[PDB]
């Protein structure tokens, strides 16, 4: 709010003894404004309590290592069909996850070509789902240049842009990301992992250079290697079912002992 | 009012600080503006180096930083004199000149003199008149090699001389480093009062 708001008046308290509350009141006469409360957060025309300041801490720092970990988790989840479908990405007819396509896609120049390719790779049903989601936002956001809301679609990830951006930009829901500059806000919209991503061959091949493997470090980052698992085998069912665990356990007690009515 | 265990703090917020608060919301805009100015300047001065004129090597002062070198303001007049470059000419061909700097030691002077000579070999000098060249670089040299050198011209790097492993001699094993420092401190501390006493006895005896 304006720092001047609620204080552009010479109001002053009447003091006690006049059978009115001791709030400051506007000076003068001959108008409705005269004698009305002022300067208060409870007063009509007053200043809000604790006026908002521009020097609020809007921005936040995140460690580079933690930012990089989030990209790794987002990429890992995008290869799991259970997590992509959990994001409602309609991939039931997609041939494979991750979906990799030849690099000549980067040279596409017409939107018709991009639309046809999404149909051929059976990703078009996600675009149609984006169309069905196109609606009007609810509430005051409509007056603040946020009238239309839709859903997120496929994220095309490319290596070198020879026209791919111009070709796909007009399709609703399509997000285009350069592989060298991956964005967690785009890869995990809403803070949820598992966005349906489509890769070009060159972008796919670069991932071992961008983030390294557990055996060799990243070559396009000064000092980065993939994070370490604290649980190599996540299949809890196999571990518990394993003979090593089973032979160590005691026999389960399954007899339910309920309250005995004392006679 | 203090409460239990805490640090005694004295925040410097007793003036009208809210009136003088510098926010940084134009920081992205400032970075863009500086970048565009750099690019505009580089295009204007092409093919001259984008960063600017070559700077000399200087040693940082004080005991905290005398182990490191960095770029200086400009080459001294002695360095230019030894290199054979007129101080007025140096600025036109991209050499920074600092008449205030004086060379205390010859090692620094020779380092910058060598830097100037090696720069002069790398320099491609276009003729003032393209049709007529007098003492300028060769047409072939200008035609292909000339390109705008991005980044500092001949960056100044801290060079470390490798010292190979060697057999320790008997003398080195017998050198008392701690006692040498302790006596050296006392010699410096007592040098004067020793000169006074030694002098004082001189006229006492004579």
């Amino acid at each position: 709010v304006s720092e001047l708001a609620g204080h552009q008046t010479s109001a002053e308290s009447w003091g006690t003894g006049r059978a009115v509350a001791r709030i400051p009141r506007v000076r003068g006469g001959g108008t409705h404004r005269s004698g009305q409360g002022a300067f208060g957060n409870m007063c009509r025309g007053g200043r809000m309590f604790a006026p908002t300041k521009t020097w609020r801490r809007w921005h936040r720092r995140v460690n580079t290592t933690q930012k990089r970990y989030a990209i790794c988790s987002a990429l890992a989840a995008s290869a799991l069909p259970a997590l992509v479908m959990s994001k409602g990405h309609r991939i039931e007819e997609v041939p494979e996850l991750p979906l990799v396509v030849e690099d000549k896609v980067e040279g596409y120049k017409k939107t018709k070509e991009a639309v046809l390719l999404l149909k051929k790779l059976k990703a078009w049903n996600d675009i149609k789902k984006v169309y069905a989601s196109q609606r009007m936002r609810a509430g005051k956001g409509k007056m603040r240049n946020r009238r239309r809301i839709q859903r997120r679609g496929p994220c095309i990830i490319y290596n070198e842009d020879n026209g791919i951006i111009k070709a796909f930009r007009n399709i609703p829901g399509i997000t285009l990301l350069n592989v060298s500059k991956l964005n967690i806000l785009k890869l995990a919209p809403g803070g949820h992992v598992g966005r349906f991503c489509i890769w070009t061959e060159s972008a796919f091949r670069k991932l071992d250079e961008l983030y390294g493997t557990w055996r060799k470090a990243a070559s396009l980052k000064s000092n980065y290697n993939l994070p370490m698992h604290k649980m190599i085998n996540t299949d809890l069912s196999r571990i518990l079912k394993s003979p090593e665990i089973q032979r160590a356990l005691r026999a389960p007690r399954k007899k339910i002992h309920r309250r005995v009515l004392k006679k | 009012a203090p409460s239990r265990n805490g640090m005694v703090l004295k925040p410097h917020f007793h003036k009208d600080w809210q009136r003088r608060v510098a926010t940084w919301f134009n920081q992205p805009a400032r970075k863009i503006r500086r970048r565009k100015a750099r690019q505009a300047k580089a295009r204007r001065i092409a093919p001259r180096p984008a960063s600017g004129p070559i700077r000399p090597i200087v040693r940082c002062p004080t005991v905290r930083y005398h182990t490191k070198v960095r770029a200086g303001r400009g080459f001294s007049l002695e360095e230019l004199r030894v290199a054979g470059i007129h101080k007025k000419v140096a600025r036109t061909i991209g050499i920074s000149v600092d008449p205030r700097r004086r060379n205390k030691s010859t090692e620094s002077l020779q380092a910058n003199v060598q830097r100037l000579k090696e720069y002069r070999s790398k320099l491609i000098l276009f003729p003032r008149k393209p049709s007529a060249p007098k003492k300028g670089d060769s047409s072939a040299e200008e035609l292909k090699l000339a390109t705008q050198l991005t980044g500092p011209v001949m960056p100044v790097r801290n060079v470390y001389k490798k010292e190979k492993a060697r057999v320790i001699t008997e003398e080195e094993k017998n050198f008392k480093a701690f006692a040498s420092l302790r006596m050296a401190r006392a010699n410096a501390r007592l040098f004067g009062i020793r000169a006074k006493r030694a002098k004082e006895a001189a006229e006492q005896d004579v």
């Binding site: 007056m143 930009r169 007009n170 | -």
Partner: protein
């Protein structure tokens, strides 16, 4: 998506410029589609509506195939009056009903020197864009 940084997407701004536009800008705002025969003949999709232009109402209660002449272009109200598009006031007076020019189709153009110049500019540009698309 719009990419020009000097063009606004603000709802309040675009509404303000629209409702406070001067008359000559309102002329462009009051454009109407040409008929298929006119569109094929001149290779022009739309023209700013003019008085003495025959139009069809294609939306609203007066929609139909009747060809009527535009008798008044009230730019201040963003509406046009067509010769048979009228209604009966209580006292019996017959008043024209305003139709927005985007809801009519021009079937005959009032050609003079200016319209012919305008038409050959739009068609030359539409054709030049084909020399782009190709």
């Amino acid at each position: 998506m719009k990419f020009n940084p000097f063009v606004t997407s603000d709802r309040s701004k675009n509404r303000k410029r629209h409702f406070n536009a001067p008359s000559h800008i309102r002329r462009k705002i009051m454009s109407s589609p040409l008929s298929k025969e006119l569109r094929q003949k001149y290779n022009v999709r739309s023209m700013p509506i003019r008085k003495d232009d025959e139009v069809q109402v294609v939306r609203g209660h007066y929609k139909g195939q009747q060809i009527g002449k535009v008798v008044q272009v009230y730019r201040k109200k963003y509406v046009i009056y067509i010769e048979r598009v009228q209604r009966e006031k209580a006292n019996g007076t017959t008043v024209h009903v305003g139709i927005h020019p985007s809801k009519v189709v021009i079937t005959r153009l009032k050609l003079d020197k200016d319209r012919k110049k305008i038409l050959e500019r739009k068609a030359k540009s539409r054709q030049v864009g084909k020399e782009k698309g190709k």
